Amino acid sequence: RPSWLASALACVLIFTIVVDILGNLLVILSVYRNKKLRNAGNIFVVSLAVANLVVAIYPYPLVLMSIFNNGWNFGYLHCQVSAFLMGLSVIGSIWNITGIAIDRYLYICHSLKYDKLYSSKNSLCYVLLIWLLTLAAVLPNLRAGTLQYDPRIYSCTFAQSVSSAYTIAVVVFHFLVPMIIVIFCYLRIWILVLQVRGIDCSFWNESYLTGSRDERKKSLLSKFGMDEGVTFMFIGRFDRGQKGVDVLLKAIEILSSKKEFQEMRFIIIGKGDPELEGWARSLEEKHGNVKVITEMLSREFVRELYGSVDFVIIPSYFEPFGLVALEAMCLGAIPIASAVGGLRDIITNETGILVKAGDPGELANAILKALELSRSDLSKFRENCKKRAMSFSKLKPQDFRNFVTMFVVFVLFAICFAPLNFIGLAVASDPASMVPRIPEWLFVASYYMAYFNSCLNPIIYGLLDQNFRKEYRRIIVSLCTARVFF
Numbered sequence: 001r002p003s004w005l006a007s008a009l010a011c012v013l014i015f016t017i018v019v020d021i022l023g024n025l026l027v028i029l030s031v032y033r034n035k036k037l038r039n040a041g042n043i044f045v046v047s048l049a050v051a052n053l054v055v056a057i058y059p060y061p062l063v064l065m066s067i068f069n070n071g072w073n074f075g076y077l078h079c080q081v082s083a084f085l086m087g088l089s090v091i092g093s094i095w096n097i098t099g100i101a102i103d104r105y106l107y108i109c110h111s112l113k114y115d116k117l118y119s120s121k122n123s124l125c126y127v128l129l130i131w132l133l134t135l136a137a138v139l140p141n142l143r144a145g146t147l148q149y150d151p152r153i154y155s156c157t158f159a160q161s162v163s164s165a166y167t168i169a170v171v172v173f174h175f176l177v178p179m180i181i182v183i184f185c186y187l188r189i190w191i192l193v194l195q196v197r198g199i200d201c202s203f204w205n206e207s208y209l210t211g212s213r214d215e216r217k218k219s220l221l222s223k224f225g226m227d228e229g230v231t232f233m234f235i236g237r238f239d240r241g242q243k244g245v246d247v248l249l250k251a252i253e254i255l256s257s258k259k260e261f262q263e264m265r266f267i268i269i270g271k272g273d274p275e276l277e278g279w280a281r282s283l284e285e286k287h288g289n290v291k292v293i294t295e296m297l298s299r300e301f302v303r304e305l306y307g308s309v310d311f312v313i314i315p316s317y318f319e320p321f322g323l324v325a326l327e328a329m330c331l332g333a334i335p336i337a338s339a340v341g342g343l344r345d346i347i348t349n350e351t352g353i354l355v356k357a358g359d360p361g362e363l364a365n366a367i368l369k370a371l372e373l374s375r376s377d378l379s380k381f382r383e384n385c386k387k388r389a390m391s392f393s394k395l396k397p398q399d400f401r402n403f404v405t406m407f408v409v410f411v412l413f414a415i416c417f418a419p420l421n422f423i424g425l426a427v428a429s430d431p432a433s434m435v436p437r438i439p440e441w442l443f444v445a446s447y448y449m450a451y452f453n454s455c456l457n458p459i460i461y462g463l464l465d466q467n468f469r470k471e472y473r474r475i476i477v478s479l480c481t482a483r484v485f486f
């Protein structure tokens with residue numbers, strides 16, 4: 001390593017210390033100052049700012065002095081405490097990040113189900129549990145003797161080579177586990193935003209339908225040359241592994257032998273596999289209560305169908321966003337759909353029948369259950385379907401930018417700490433052999449990239465959040481503009 005490399009690392013820490021202290025003090029002040037930033041959900045933000053602030057006050061300055069000293073001149077006590085506080089900061093950061101991810105996911109869910117805004121009643125209570133969990137994780141390292149000075153990075157930290165069992169547990173429980181939780185939270189938020197964006201209440205609206213539902217159904221069934229009965233509808237691509245038309249076709253065959261089949265009517269709409277197109281056409285010939293439509297219908301006629309049929313069958317294997325289920329629910333069509341992502345998020349227990357995907361027996365039984373439902377039970381189901389669709393459209397004028405800032409805060413944390421945890425696993429495999437087998441440049445960059453993270457969040461809040469940006473300017477001016485008397 002050259003001479004300039006040591007001076008380069010010192011610049012990174014000097015920048016980190018200054019931007020951490022000044023920036024995170026602004027983050028704390030802004031939450032207190034701004035009325036819009038002042039909320040229970042932002043207690044986790046202050047807790048994360050405190051976590052970041054800890055390392056800048058005592059650990060980082062000792063690391064900076066150690067670069068110029070080219071060794072540890074502060075004894076064992078300062079080495080033990082400096083390493084312990086680095087643990088509390090790093091562990092506290094990832095768990096506060098999960099705390100925000102769970103808080104935000106619970107916010108969108110509350111916003112859909114209720115008219116009153118989400119108030120994080122136990123926000124401070126969860127923050128106190130995070131620091132009780134953080135303390136429980138970093139404390140065993142003092143008695144285990146896994147905290148020591150590393151000459152390569154000029155600091156006292158957790159030695160990945162002391163105990164592999166401690167190293168693996170740190171990676172698994174305090175990186176992999178929190179990440180899985182966070183990814184699941186932001187993936188579920190993103191799908192719910194696309195469903196809010198996707199729905200169109202100006203098109204999929206009962207206002208466009210003139211007559212009564214019973215009148216519209218009798219008219220629809222008469223056009224297809226069928227009498228009155230519980231009408232079921234399918235509208236999807238004909239394939240063997242995605243939309244599940246094959247599950248529906250096999251379910252009709254199971255039902256055809258039953259005495260209850262006479263009371264049923266089926267409208268299968270779609271195109272795809274010619275073999276599946278033939279199977280549907282075969283059932284259409286054998287049974288006068290089964291009608292197949294292979295041509296492509298207009299949105300106008302599909303909307304007419306949703307407002308006429310009793311049930312919409314969504315027997316999909318994989319469905320990311322159940323826009324079809326919401327569009328059907330808009331016009332009071334009760335969905336019988338597979339318990340798959342998107343569909344499980346849309347269809348509640350009071351707004352439809354949920355079925356195990358890829359089971360023709362479970363679908364046939366669900367169709368039998370749907371059949372034995374009186375006009376009164378049906379009217380309440382349709383009412384609930386409409387109420388559920390309304391809550392999605394309700395969230396359209398909302399500003400979803402805060403969800404993006406929080407996601408960037410996490411994404412940058414993951415980028416900063418991913419190489420360190422990968423090196424951790426590589427060292428844990430063979431502590432004696434992998435220590436020289438790992439390049440010094442990679443090890444040094446991974447630690448200082450992780451250190452640089454302690455000053456990133458105040459920069460992110462300023463660049464992406466308008467409330468934080470406005471307050472940074474407000475505080476900077478207020479503290480530098482003198483009061484005078486003319």
Ligand SMILES: CCC(=O)NCC[C@@H]1CCc2ccc3c(c21)CCO3
Nearest residue numbers: 083086087090141158170420421424
């Ligand atoms: C796999 C290890 C890794 O890459 N990163 C965690 C090292 C962090 C940062 C400093 C510090 C101090 C004490 C402590 C821990 C840490 C984990 C639990 O005890």
